[PDB]
Amino acid sequence: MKVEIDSFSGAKIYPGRGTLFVRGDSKIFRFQNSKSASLFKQRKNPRRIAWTVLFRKHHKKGITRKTVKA
């Protein structure tokens, strides 16, 4: 079993959950729920949506030896 991730928001996606969408080009788009999906369907930009892993990474939100002996 793989956890997948929401390619829009970035939120973890547990099995048998969320939706999945195959665009014409075979780019596969996995959503954790209707909310992310419905954004995708309005042409909404994740980096422009405050709560997306994309957005907060863009805004840098809250990221906070050996011996050679050869």
């Binding site: 079993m1 939120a11 099995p15 959950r17 909310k35 809250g62 906070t64």
Partner: protein
């Protein structure tokens, strides 16, 4: 004249009448066939339907397109804190059917069961079984006189057990008392076992095990009065139609001059008894186990209780059963689990499951997390907190 096109009849006449079932307890209409060579155990169990979650497991069905593939399955979760035995009842077969010729009740009765014999408990003097308890003051030869009586007579012996309601998140305080049939051998051995268990406790794993097939017996979640169309599945009548579209157009032919037991008509829906069969037992809980939700594959210590807790229900603090699919009735309702009425080979049964993963995400919405320990990890630290 005649139908002009043929279709099945709507609805199953066998489940008539559609009336409101006799009580929220569903009655056990039968028990497994007694094999007396086996040790004495319960044939059924009492519990409460909590909620549902999702599963992940590998599938053993050689030749299936999913053989050795993972599958998600819905399951349901029954709060199953051990029953307490309060008494045994004996039955003799007569030409008129089976008949109960006595009951024996243990000395001390729990204030949960006592609460069941009372409509208003706070006002009562709580006199129940006070004089019955006086039957123990001596060596209890009055008691024994029945116990050996049931031994002498009685082709069939059942145990009276009750739930521990207090031990569950419910608000209901008044336990549920029910007759359970005893399918270990030798009617004497049965009432022996009965006595030694008076006032004692019995938990769920003495009854059922994993992979086992068990039947559910419960009262249907009720909808009150219903229209013809949703109750029987009648086709909707056309838009253009005067005076109602959710109906039967022809309540019946002119003759006979009376509308028929077989015609769809609007009345109660829901809240019936249902006896539902064949569920595979996916998990046998122990409330004394931390890492209930865990799995040999999962390993991270969590119980089956979701974040935010089973909606409308609570925390599952005790032993429990997890069963595949869905069970009749709704959350908080008292539920009976019964051993199967028959030996089922079926290969679908006899599949011995091993859960990989039990979905812990909260059910009060679209949950993003399992543990609280994960939610912190992903989200990090907040304006409360540190």
């Amino acid at each position: 004249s005649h139908r002009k096109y043929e279709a099945p009849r709507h609805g199953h006449l066998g489940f008539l009448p559609r009336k409101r079932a006799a009580s929220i307890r569903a009655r056990v209409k039968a028990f497994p066939k007694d094999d007396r060579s086996k040790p004495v155990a319960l044939t059924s169990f009492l519990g409460y339907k909590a909620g549902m979650t999702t599963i992940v497991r590998d599938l053993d069905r050689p030749g299936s397109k999913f053989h050795k593939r993972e599958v998600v399955e819905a399951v349901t979760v029954v709060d199953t804190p051990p029953v307490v035995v309060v008494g045994v009842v004996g039955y003799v077969e007569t030409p008129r059917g089976l008949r109960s010729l006595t009951t024996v009740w243990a000395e001390h009765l729990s204030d949960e069961v006592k609460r069941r014999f009372y409509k208003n408990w706070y006002k009562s003097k709580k006199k129940a079984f006070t004089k019955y308890s006086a039957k123990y003051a001596q060596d209890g030869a009055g008691i024994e006189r029945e116990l050996a009586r049931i031994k002498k007579y009685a082709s069939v012996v059942r145990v009276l057990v009750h739930t521990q309601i207090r031990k569950t998140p419910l608000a209901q305080k008044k336990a549920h008392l029910a007759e359970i049939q005893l399918n270990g051998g030798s009617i004497s051995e049965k009432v022996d076992w009965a006595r030694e268990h008076f006032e004692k406790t019995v938990a769920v794993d003495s009854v059922f095990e994993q992979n086992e097939m068990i039947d559910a017996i419960a009262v249907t979640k009720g909808h009150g009065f219903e229209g013809v169309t949703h109750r029987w599945g009648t086709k909707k009548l056309p838009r253009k139609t005067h005076r109602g579209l959710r109906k039967v157009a022809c309540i019946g032919a002119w003759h006979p001059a009376h509308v028929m037991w077989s015609v769809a008509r609007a009345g109660q829906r829901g809240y019936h008894s249902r006896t539902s069969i064949n569920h595979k037992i996916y998990r046998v809980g122990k409330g004394d186990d931390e890492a209930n939700g865990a799995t040999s594959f999962d390993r991270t210590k969590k119980t089956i209780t979701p974040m935010g807790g089973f909606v409308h229900y609570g925390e599952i603090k005790n032993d429990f059963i997890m069963v595949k699919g869905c069970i009749p009735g709704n959350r908080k309702r008292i539920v009976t689990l019964r051993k199967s009425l028959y030996t089922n080979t079926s290969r679908k049964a006899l599949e011995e499951v091993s859960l990989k993963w039990i979905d812990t995400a909260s059910k009060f919405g679209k949950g993003r997390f399992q543990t609280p320990a994960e939610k912190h990890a992903f989200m990090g630290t907040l304006k409360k907190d540190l």
